[PDB]
Amino acid sequence: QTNPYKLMDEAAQKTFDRLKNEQPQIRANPDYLRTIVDQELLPYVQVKYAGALVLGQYYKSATPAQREAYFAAFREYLKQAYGQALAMYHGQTYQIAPEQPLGDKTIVPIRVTIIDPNGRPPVRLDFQWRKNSQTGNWQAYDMIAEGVSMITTKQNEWGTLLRTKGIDGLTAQLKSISQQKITLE
């Protein structure tokens, strides 16, 4: 399947299936959550498009080798960070927005609501899907989470680091963060 609603449905279903049913494996090795991210989610993420946007002005002035190193570190960072997000699983489930015709739409926002029955209030995610012009595949290049863009958030969080130490500095920080072990609550 190739339609971005169907990709959302599949990725959600598979991820929650493994979270629901493989807690022994996750408790035994929390880093297994990085594998779930790597297999079920990351292939559908437009990592370089997002990463370039996070860099902003610093992307244009970076060399190809700097860019390569940055994108590698950024990908590893995403595995760690969203692995750590999956570590917050405690029986939540999800509802995805219903499929709508694609038409000639170029960027398709697809909402998923993370529901915690009898627990915490809903968490609204809005994935920004577009067609990768090179690969021909639909991918998400950003996620709005609780009303905050992940790209924008990271621009803000890493702004001073970029202003003072540039893409080299950010690459080193991403690599550092990606090496932190995932922890369960």
Dmax over CA atoms of the chain, in Å, equals: 51
Resolution (Å units) = 1.5
The C-alpha atoms of residue 13 and residue 66 are separated, in whole angstroms, by 37
The C-alpha atoms of residue 126 and residue 147 are separated, in whole angstroms, by 8
The C-alpha atoms of residue 119 and residue 117 are separated, in whole angstroms, by 5
Total Cβ atoms within 10 A of residue 86: 21
| Token code pair at residue 142 | 């950003």
The C-alpha atoms of residue 90 and residue 12 are separated, in whole angstroms, by 15
110 strand-pairing partners: 127
Q: Given CA atoms 145, 148, 151, 154 in this order, what sign does their dihedral have?
A: negative
Residue given tokens 């002035």 in the structure block: 61
DSSP states of 113-166 as a string? EEE-TTSSPPEEEEEEEEE-TTT--EEEEEEEETTEEHHHHHHHHTHHHHHHHH
| DSSP reduced 3-state for 169 | helix
Strands of 107-115's sheet, edge to edge? 93-96, 107-115, 123-131, 138-145, 148-149
Decide if 11 contacts 44 (C-beta within 8 A): yes
* Residue 94: its H or E element: strand 93-96
| Token code pair at residue 93 | 């489930």
Closest CA to 155 of 141, 170, 168, 175: 170
| DSSP reduced 3-state for 55 | helix
